[PDB]
Amino acid sequence: SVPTKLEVVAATPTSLLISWDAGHWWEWVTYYRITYGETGGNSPVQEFTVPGYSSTATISGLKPGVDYTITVYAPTSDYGSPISINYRT
Amino acid sequence: PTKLEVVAATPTSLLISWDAGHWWEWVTYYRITYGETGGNSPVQEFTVPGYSSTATISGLKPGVDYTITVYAPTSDYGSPISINYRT
Amino acid sequence: MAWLILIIAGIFEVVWAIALKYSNGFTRLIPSMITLIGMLISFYLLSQATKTLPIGTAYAIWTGIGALGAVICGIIFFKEPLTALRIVFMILLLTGIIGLKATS
Amino acid sequence: MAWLILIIAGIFEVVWAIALKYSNGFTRLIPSMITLIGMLISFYLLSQATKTLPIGTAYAIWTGIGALGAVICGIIFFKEPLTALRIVFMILLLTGIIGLKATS
């Protein structure tokens, strides 16, 4: 049920500004956790978190031309499924 | 509190300290105000947690005589301590 | 005044009590926020009321308002079973609170 | 043993009540500090005993120890009034509280 509609608002060879749909006020969580990594097979992803009131997030320091997978998780598995996208910088 | 000293000082900032007492005299927060000794304005004021016995006043004009006071939460303690000091 | 502060503190006691369960693992924002706020208010007001009222009376009346409002809200908004036992207990609670305020 | 940690949570309830009284409206550090830590001990110790035990009996005994110890340590430490009317209405309030919690 949350979050919804993960998409890259803006993009640069090194950075991606992404956003999602937090849902209705009763669905808003206390924080989301975001995970970005090389879509290949190197498991040391990079991870950070974002306050539940924020619906956007910027992601700097990406190698130009690479294709990354980007995942947004709610605090618990209760609320829904984590959503993810692919993007080549 | 007591013993309001100016530990260190630069042209634009002071480091101040005070004696909290011990154990039972301690309070949860002190309130530090400061301003030009004369010239009206208002005074600036901030608040520090009561476990720290020091404070740092910053952004002062060099050469001016300021006055600094430290307050306990209420007057039912050890009265407000006050000093003057030129930067 | 200190008694009015006590009443309001018990009110906020029950508000944060219900908002806590409406939050999940402290993970639903709007509930959690209300819990955090309602707590901070409640206890603060308690700390104020305890300045002038005895700690036993203050704690007891604060707890009692919390519980009485918890049962009122449970019945009204949660389809809770209303026993005659519960009615006599609510009556005892209100009698105690009123008599304690009347013996000031 | 879960009963014993419930008893100890009820004791820490009285602990933070007395410390809140000593904090003079949350102004004297250390009582305030005892009030805050002793709180989340009691709140934590409870949730563990509440795991094993029925929530109703657990809450009843928890707030019973809390309120009764508050009243007693109040008439002791702070020489709070020991009137027949006060003890009577305190009994009524505590029995109402304990009953409403033993039901729900």
Author numbering:
A (entry chain C): 4 to 92
B (entry chain D): 6 to 92
C (entry chain B), D (entry chain A): 1 to 104
What's in the article?
The asymmetric unit contains one Gdx-Clo dimer and two Clo-L10 monobodies, one bound to each subunit. Comparing subunit A and subunit B, the domains possess near structural identity (RMSD 0.5 Å for Cα 1−62), but are offset by a rigid body rotation of about 30°. Inspection of the regions that change in accessibility during the transport cycle shows that, for each TM3, only one of the two GxxxAxxxG packing motifs is buried at one time, and that burial alternates with conformational exchange. On the open side of the transporter, several charged amino acids, K21A from loop 1A and E80A and R86A from loop 3A, are solvent-exposed in the aqueous chamber. Upon conformational exchange, K21A, E80A, and R86A, converge on loop 2B and the N-terminal end of helix 3B, forming cross-subunit H-bond interactions with the backbone and sidechain atoms of L53B-T57B.
Membrane proteins from the small multidrug resistance (SMR) family are a major driver of the spread of drug resistance genes among bacteria. The two 4-TM helix subunits of Gdx-Clo are arranged antiparallel with respect to each other in non-equivalent “A” and “B” conformations.
